[PDB]
Design a protein around this ligand. Structure first.
Ligand code: DHT
Lengths: 242, 8
């Protein structure tokens, strides 16, 4: 009904395969090297997805590029959670068709806590009866949920943009605004996870030569350049709730 | 930056 909703649905990415060799035995390096590749693949789709976003061309270029490189973990995690929820009703983590984590893979990835945290998110989509329309909208907002504390180049267009996106999630909601609490609460809960995942990948990066884990070129840049800014507290998510 | 050349 909104143009807005129309758009989000129009531009929502398709399936992205990891390229994983499900014939070889589960193993940290095989698994994590496939996840990293999928990250990269998923990121090209996030850039294209983001550029076709309402208002997105508004922002300064460096602002566009920054916001993307700060928020990519969160978005990917969110939609991975939806993917899992809609395809395997949250029983397993559906990273891509060729990369589904069962508990064994959860443990082999050495990321178990985090995966369980992600499997929970997924279940929330269920327990809260999240609509495809709420999902799109929430995901949209997640691109505008992490900023450096020194603010952006055009902090004003950003704020405008972020304010409108909230107004839209509100519109597709509109006792009832308890739904808002819930959705904002769920949204807030993505960050802790993304942060946990950020430390994890960053270390993985540091020691990657010595565990034969393969980082794609652009992924190593981002993780070495933009991610530490987050981890050092220079870049912060915006929570709805203190 | 690879990301930046890519983005543009
Ligand atoms: C974003 C990805 C890749 C895409 C996805 O569906 C969610 C998933 C969450 C964990 C990330 C992973 C990309 C590669 C990472 C960053 C690994 O280095 C460690 C954690 C992985």
């Amino acid at each position: 009904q909104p143009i807005f909703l129309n758009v989000l649905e129009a531009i929502e990415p398709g399936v992205v395969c990891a390229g994983h060799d499900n014939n070889q035995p589960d193993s940290f390096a095989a698994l994590l090297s496939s996840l990293n590749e999928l990250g990269e693949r998923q990121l090209v789709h996030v850039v294209k997805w983001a550029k076709a976003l309402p208002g997105f061309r508004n922002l300064h270029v460096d602002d566009q590029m920054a916001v993307i490189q700060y928020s990519w973990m969160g978005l990917m995690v969110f939609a991975m959670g939806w993917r899992s929820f809609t395809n395997v009703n949250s029983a397993m983590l559906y990273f891509a068709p060729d990369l589904v984590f069962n508990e064994y893979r959860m443990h082999k990835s050495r990321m178990y806590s985090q995966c369980v945290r992600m499997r929970h998110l997924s279940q929330e989509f269920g327990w809260l009866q999240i609509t495809p329309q709420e999902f799109l909208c929430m995901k949209a907002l997640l691109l505008f949920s992490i900023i450096p504390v020194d603010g952006l180049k055009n902090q004003k267009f950003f704020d405008e943009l972020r304010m409108n996106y909230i107004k839209e999630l509100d519109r597709i909601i509109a006792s009832c605004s308890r739904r808002f609490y819930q959705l904002t609460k769920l949204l807030d809960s993505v960050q802790p996870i993304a942060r946990e995942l950020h430390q994890f990948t960053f270390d993985l990066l540091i020691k990657s030569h010595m565990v034969s884990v393969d980082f794609p070129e652009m992924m190593a840049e981002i993780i070495s350049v933009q991610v530490p800014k987050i981890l050092s507290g220079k870049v912060k998510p915006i929570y709805f709730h203190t | 930056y690879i990301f930046d050349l890519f983005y543009k």
